[PDB]
Amino acid sequence: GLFGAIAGFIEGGWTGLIDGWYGYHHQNEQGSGYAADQKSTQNAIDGITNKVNSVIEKMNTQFTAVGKEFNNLERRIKNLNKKVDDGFLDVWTYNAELLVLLENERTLDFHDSNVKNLYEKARSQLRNNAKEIGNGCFEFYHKCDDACMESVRNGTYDYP
Amino acid sequence: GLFGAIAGFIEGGWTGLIDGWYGYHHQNEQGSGYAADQKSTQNAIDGITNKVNSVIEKMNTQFTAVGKEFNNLERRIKNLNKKVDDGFLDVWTYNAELLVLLENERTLDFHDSNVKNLYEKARSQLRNNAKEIGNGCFEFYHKCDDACMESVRNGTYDYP
Amino acid sequence: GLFGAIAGFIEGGWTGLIDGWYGYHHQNEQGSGYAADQKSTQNAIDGITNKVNSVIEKMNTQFTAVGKEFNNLERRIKNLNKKVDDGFLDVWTYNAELLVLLENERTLDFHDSNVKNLYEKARSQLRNNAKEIGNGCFEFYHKCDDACMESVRNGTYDYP
Amino acid sequence: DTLCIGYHANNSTDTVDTVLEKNVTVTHSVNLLEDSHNGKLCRLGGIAPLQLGKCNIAGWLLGNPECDLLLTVSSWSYIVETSNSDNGTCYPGDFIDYEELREQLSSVSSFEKFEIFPKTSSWPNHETTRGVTAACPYAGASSFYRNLLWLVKKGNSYPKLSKSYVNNKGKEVLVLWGVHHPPTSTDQQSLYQNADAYVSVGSSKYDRRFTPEIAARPKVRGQAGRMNYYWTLLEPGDTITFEATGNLVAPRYAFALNRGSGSGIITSDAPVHDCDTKCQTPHGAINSSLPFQNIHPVTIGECPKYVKSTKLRMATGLRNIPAR
Amino acid sequence: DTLCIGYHANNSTDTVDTVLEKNVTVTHSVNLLEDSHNGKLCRLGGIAPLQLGKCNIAGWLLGNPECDLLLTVSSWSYIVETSNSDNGTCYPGDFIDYEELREQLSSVSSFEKFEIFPKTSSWPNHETTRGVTAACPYAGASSFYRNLLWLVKKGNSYPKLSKSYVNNKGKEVLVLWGVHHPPTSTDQQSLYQNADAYVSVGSSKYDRRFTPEIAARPKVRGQAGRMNYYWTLLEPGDTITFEATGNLVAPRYAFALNRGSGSGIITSDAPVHDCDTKCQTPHGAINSSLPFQNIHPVTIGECPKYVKSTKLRMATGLRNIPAR
Amino acid sequence: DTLCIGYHANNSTDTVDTVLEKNVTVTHSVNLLEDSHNGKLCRLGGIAPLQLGKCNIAGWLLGNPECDLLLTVSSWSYIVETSNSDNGTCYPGDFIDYEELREQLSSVSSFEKFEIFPKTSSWPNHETTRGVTAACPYAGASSFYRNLLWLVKKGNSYPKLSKSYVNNKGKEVLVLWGVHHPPTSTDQQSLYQNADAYVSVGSSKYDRRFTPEIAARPKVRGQAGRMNYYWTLLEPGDTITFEATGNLVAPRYAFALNRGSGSGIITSDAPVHDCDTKCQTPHGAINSSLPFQNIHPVTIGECPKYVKSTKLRMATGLRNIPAR
Numbered sequence A, B, C: 001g002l003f004g005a006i007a008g009f010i011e012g013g014w015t016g017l018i019d020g021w022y023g024y025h026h027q028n029e030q031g032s033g034y035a036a037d038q039k040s041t042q043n044a045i046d047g048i049t050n051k052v053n054s055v056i057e058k059m060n061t062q063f064t065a066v067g068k069e070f071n072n073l074e075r076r077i078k079n080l081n082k083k084v085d086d087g088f089l090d091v092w093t094y095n096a097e098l099l100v101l102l103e104n105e106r107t108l109d110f111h112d113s114n115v116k117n118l119y120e121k122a123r124s125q126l127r128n129n130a131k132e133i134g135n136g137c138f139e140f141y142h143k144c145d146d147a148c149m150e151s152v153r154n155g156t157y158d159y160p
Numbered sequence D, E, F: 001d002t003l004c005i006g007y008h009a010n011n012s013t014d015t016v017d018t019v020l021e022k023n024v025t026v027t028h029s030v031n032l033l034e035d036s037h038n039g040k041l042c043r044l045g046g047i048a049p050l051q052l053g054k055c056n057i058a059g060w061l062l063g064n065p066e067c068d069l070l071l072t073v074s075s076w077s078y079i080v081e082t083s084n085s086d087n088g089t090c091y092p093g094d095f096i097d098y099e100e101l102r103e104q105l106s107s108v109s110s111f112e113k114f115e116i117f118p119k120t121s122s123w124p125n126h127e128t129t130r131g132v133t134a135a136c137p138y139a140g141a142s143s144f145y146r147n148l149l150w151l152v153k154k155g156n157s158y159p160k161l162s163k164s165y166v167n168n169k170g171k172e173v174l175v176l177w178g179v180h181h182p183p184t185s186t187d188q189q190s191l192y193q194n195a196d197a198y199v200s201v202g203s204s205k206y207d208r209r210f211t212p213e214i215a216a217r218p219k220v221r222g223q224a225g226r227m228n229y230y231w232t233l234l235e236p237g238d239t240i241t242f243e244a245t246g247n248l249v250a251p252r253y254a255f256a257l258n259r260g261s262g263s264g265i266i267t268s269d270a271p272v273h274d275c276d277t278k279c280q281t282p283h284g285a286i287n288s289s290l291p292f293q294n295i296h297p298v299t300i301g302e303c304p305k306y307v308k309s310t311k312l313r314m315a316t317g318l319r320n321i322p323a324r
């Protein structure tokens, strides 16, 4: 992890989380559960969707490409024509595999960053009203019910 | 942003700041105003100017390129020539647009990283002498005159 | 630096460290010295090794590629042939240099990130039992002995 | 009370590669590479391909006796030659600028065949009933090209003939013809009387003269003589004139061509089928929205870019760590 | 007392795109794509271009009667053909390897035109005053090419002519000539007596023999006959010899070529103006320091790399968040 | 007590560039750009290269009197021409489709030379002992190509000759021959008696007729006459027939060709050495596992991708900040 979050200080993922990519768990007096941060999750969906389409927009469409015959006295043009077809083929094959390799690295880092930023957002809200237990978990000092938890999620935990 | 700073925990920019990309506001009992952080602004200006020169450097200037004529019994080589011309045009258009897209993304993240490092720097200095309000603002405990403020800027502060 | 660690808050490197890329210094009552962190150094070696390997893979070997002759009335195809040779030569020269130029950038940032994460890891591992001096150093409180320093390194430590 | 921050995980087994690490399991991804086809030659734009079968283009345009099945076809989505397309010029000889003509047909989507020089009215002074050979059999009996007419001396006489056609089709007209070369001066005389015949062909831009080259070359299909084939595209409104004192294998049928780029000629052994597609390859039809395909570099229609990749998967989700 | 860390922001409306987001407003950015030109044909390397106008290369080199304006031009920075460049070979025929010649001209900066075979003294035994035709009129009357000399029999006699020229110029010499083909054997004798004439041309590297092809081709510009044009580049010190018994349209003016490289022929109806430039396209001159341009693929001189992009802007500043 | 977190450093001077900064000194790095070669022409697959030295493909295949050294060579890993390979056709003339023949040879790794038409036994009715010329000397005396036989009349008589050869070598047979063109009709009759001779050549795919073209061309190597060189690749099992009444420079030796994928012809002045390699260039061989080389674009064997780059160093370690 380039940002230390995913598979970093937050060792594993939650199969229990099924509303988005990033979220909170919470263990209040009223009961536990999971909840996805729609804000960061959607923004991620939009970005990745854009990426996928940007990749596709670049790689043109192939229309009609047919061969050419050559007679026994046109061996040079024939090889020239092959050098041209093999050349562009290799180039485009390179471009496509390379772009995908590079964007796959970016994408995983992108997610890592978002998880990280989310942790810092939550942390910057709770300040000292809760301590960092590690594993991205925040143990509260003052009892926080579901109504309270919810406020932390939508970033309106507005409480001294 | 990838680093959470720009358009992040520092919601917006300062039309007020006008002598750098990264700067300070500061509101001392003596007054207010905006001050750009040379160290940074300049640094980023060198990296960016270098990135731009590099992009231009990679692209080879075009020299004399004209069309070729073919008679009515040379439709094959005529088409080969067109395949070649169209082949390279599509490749270079791909490289130009792709490089610009990848670098743009990087540039904005470069800036995000710069603003973030600046904060963490002003923060590592003040330590106990002030508190993190958010929005990149630090409220001083022991007061801080224009002479003290500047001291933070040029990273000479010092006073654990 | 993109992650503010290397050449950042941890100026200079340790020529004394010679068993890894990322390590700790440690200055105990029993003595001082250096110790690299396998977990990190090894993990990076792998990634970087996979990177260089990935690059070599993408670049295709060059088999027999010989020129062609043309008589004095085949100037048009001779030029076509040349346009093709130079076309692909430039495209690949562009691809080679650009990929290396970009991976070098990513590589350094990768390391910078690795240090930063090592710090942050040690940081939260200690917390109260020591204070942040700077330059990536932690000054304990309960005089951390040798066996103690190792506990921090091997990640165990775990002391309230 | 506790509030943790975590990320999604699932039962996905999808894996992608990255610069630093390979075979990384992920939660979500998309395959950009299409590798499936129906293994059939289908219609494009509701139009069936021209299946040349055991015949090649030469055999098609000349009207080789073995290609009668193609006689009534005049429009196609693309032309298909198979590995066994061997029936072409049944009478040995050189087919001049043959590859160029194939290149020309690649952007022809249909035509109107018409008897440019009717057989029963165009040659009052020459024999039109004996131009057959064992080299171009049909039903076991000697025959000849359907679109050409082998003219010979009539009652020991081959007067100078002169025929002209003015193209009023409003489009290009492909006109084919041949020049026969007997193996012997005796055959030359038995066929065309005139020991030193010649053939002349001209239009506004075409202009060539042919002389018989009498000689015995190795027998091909029983023939020691040779027959060379020629063609030209007569422009709308232009005129083509044939002059000869022997050796002319006159045009009988010609074609008024309709241009329609976006068409082509492929080599496939895949079977034609009652089916439709937006994309066609020599192996079969592709039906997908992915940007890449590794089926075949030759394409006709709307198709994904051909690439040599075996795998192209883009990660969209994140490193899947269920730690179950 | 408070201190805040922040970033710049302005009134910029500049936007750039990224992988993850489209149309992002930023503080500062640079446009790398040039899209402007003066819509004019200017002079490169301080020399004006050769405006063929109504004529094409053939007309210019052969000296078509309607191209006398070009007779004075002997130096140029590039050649310009227009949508109306039709005055070429007025007498109908084939210009052999015409495209190759045009290609050779690519790197020719100028030439030294000379009268390789002076008309008033090179052919003592042949008529040099009757080589005119209605297919090549001038001021209503019949004329011919300025650079070629159509020789015909003198007093009912056409002796075997032999004329040679030694390239003394220290550089390549472009030699052009033609071979006439009358429509009937009557014309053949009216013009050259000899029924079995031939034209022979040879140098150290060139060697070809031409034979009259009497035939009535469809009339073009009123002619049933045909005239084929040929050329060769005589190397410094080499010798070219012409031998003929008829049908020779002898060279009159030849061209000693000077190479200057990096040029060519463009087709454009844009106007030529008293103006200078480093980059010229068929649409107009370019004055830019940008790396790319979407003006035109055809370029002459030093130009920005042509690309098919509509926009190409790099971000230099940051995401503009004025939050006003 | 104190515990610090830091990063490695050493005495490395390695430098690499990035988009943002240049000359960045790093601790570890790998060079990906090969730039070293042993400057020697080595052998691939354990087989030596064919050094033509002062001869070129033409002189070698035809058997120029100055290429006798090559006579025993029948296998090679690649062909090498020096900047002094000037010995080709000693008797002036055109070598038809010469560049194509060279392209053909690029995929031939060896052949079997055999006397297709034995000098003593093939031409009973023609002179086989006078086909020499001062243009193709050897030891000061007049000579001729070792693989061709210049036939002339026998006792003031040149009967129509007819000789055939059936290709039973099971592979392509390269047959070469020539047609001579005397400078004058006196020479024509003096060498071949017949004033109106012709040469005919035919196989199942080849069919051409040649006529003598008498004319005095500028002397090249003291010859005003010319001689054209022809070749063809007779397919396994096919037959080639030569018929002539004069002017035929008959095949004497032919070559059964063995196709060998990957190989070519190069121009180098580097020395052949008792060395071995997997990658060969005109400058010398390469022994490297690096992805790139900037030595030469022309390659033979397993080689690194050629590129124009001057440096291709990839950083593996981190920025080096020893600070001592």
Ligand SMILES: CC(=O)N[C@H]1[C@H]([C@H](O)[C@H](O)CO)OC(C(=O)O)=C[C@@H]1O
Pocket (backbone or CB within 6 Å): D130, D131, D132, D133, D134, D135, D142, D150, D152, D181, D182, D183, D187, D191, D223, D225
């Ligand atoms: C038109 C004509 O005369 N055809 C005859 C043909 C021809 O004479 C020869 O092929 C030319 O050399 O010979 C044989 C044949 O089966 O081919 C009988 C044909 O009736």
Ligand SMILES: CC(=O)N[C@@H]1[C@@H](O)[C@H](O)[C@@H](CO)O[C@@H]1O
Pocket (backbone or CB within 6 Å): D064, D065, D066, D086, D087, D088, D089, D090, D135, D136, D137
């Ligand atoms: C007119 C013609 O070409 N007939 C031949 C036929 O005799 C032969 O058996 C077959 C083999 O491929 O080819 C062609 O069909």
Ligand SMILES: CC(=O)N[C@@H]1[C@@H](O)[C@H](O)[C@@H](CO)O[C@@H]1O
Pocket (backbone or CB within 6 Å): E054, E064, E065, E066, E086, E087, E088, E089, E090, E135, E136, E137
């Ligand atoms: C001299 C000649 O070639 N004849 C005419 C010429 O007069 C005319 O100006 C031109 C325009 O189409 O067409 C032909 O060139």
Ligand SMILES: CC(=O)N[C@@H]1[C@@H](O)[C@H](O)[C@@H](CO)O[C@@H]1O
Pocket (backbone or CB within 6 Å): F064, F065, F066, F086, F087, F088, F089, F090, F135, F136, F137
């Ligand atoms: C038959 C033949 O080609 N011989 C000449 C030889 O006399 C001459 O010295 C040499 C110069 O390079 O060219 C040729 O080899």
